[PDB]
């Protein structure tokens, strides 16, 4: 006449057993079914919080740098104006990394 449930619930109704308190048996509320407080010795709850577990700068074009005079500069495009005109080209030198922009 006994049912196997989780230890946190009554085994005759299905209702929730309260926390242990100032007595030696914890009882359900809606039926009055006493269970030993001593039976919660295997009520173990684990929780693990894991904090911390376990280039060539684009294509090049053979353009001379303003500062260092290197023969090539890496380029990147970005259409920064409206859709009416242009395409703004960003350059970056290979050696000394001097970045200038052209607006066409």
């Amino acid at each position: 006449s006994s049912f196997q449930s989780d230890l946190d619930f009554c085994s005759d109704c299905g209702s929730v057993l309260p926390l242990p308190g100032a007595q030696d048996t914890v009882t359900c509320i809606r039926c009055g079914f006493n269970i030993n407080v001593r039976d919660f010795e295997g009520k173990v709850v684990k929780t693990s919080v894991v904090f911390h577990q376990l280039e060539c700068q684009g294509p090049v074009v053979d353009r001379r740098c303003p500062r260092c005079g290197h023969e090539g500069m890496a380029y990147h495009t970005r259409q920064m104006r409206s859709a009416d005109e242009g395409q703004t080209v960003f350059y970056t030198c290979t050696n000394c990394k001097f970045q200038e922009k052209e607006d066409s």
């Binding site: 006449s1 006994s2 049912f3 196997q4 449930s5 009554c10 085994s11 005759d12 109704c13 299905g14 809606r30 039926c31 079914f33």
Partner: protein
């Protein structure tokens, strides 16, 4: 690769679904089932109530009210027996009852 001769023989064997846990320790527990009077209209074919007498609580199981499960209407439930010497899995119509303990009003 075992086989079994499917010998459908026909009565509706009840199956129980406890809302408390598994009935793992059977003892002195009385089971009685109830059926509606008017078998004329086709609602009597589903009206059935199973009652469970225990000294502590009483468990009741419907087929129609709120909380009656939908597994035995959107799907059929059968029971195999498999008389092993003869090797025939003889099959009965069955129902599943989700029992709920009765308290008060």
């Amino acid at each position: 690769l075992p086989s079994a001769r499917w010998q459908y023989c026909g009565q509706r064997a009840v199956l129980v679904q406890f809302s408390n846990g598994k009935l793992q320790s059977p003892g002195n527990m009385r089971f009685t089932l109830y059926e509606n009077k008017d078998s004329t209209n086709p609602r009597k074919r589903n009206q059935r109530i199973l009652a469970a007498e225990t000294d502590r609580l009483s468990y009741v199981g419907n087929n129609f009210g709120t909380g009656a499960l939908k597994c035995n209407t959107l799907c059929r439930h059968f029971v195999g027996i498999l008389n092993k010497t003869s090797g025939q899995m003889e099959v009965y119509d069955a129902e599943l009852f989700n029992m709920q303990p009765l308290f008060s009003d």
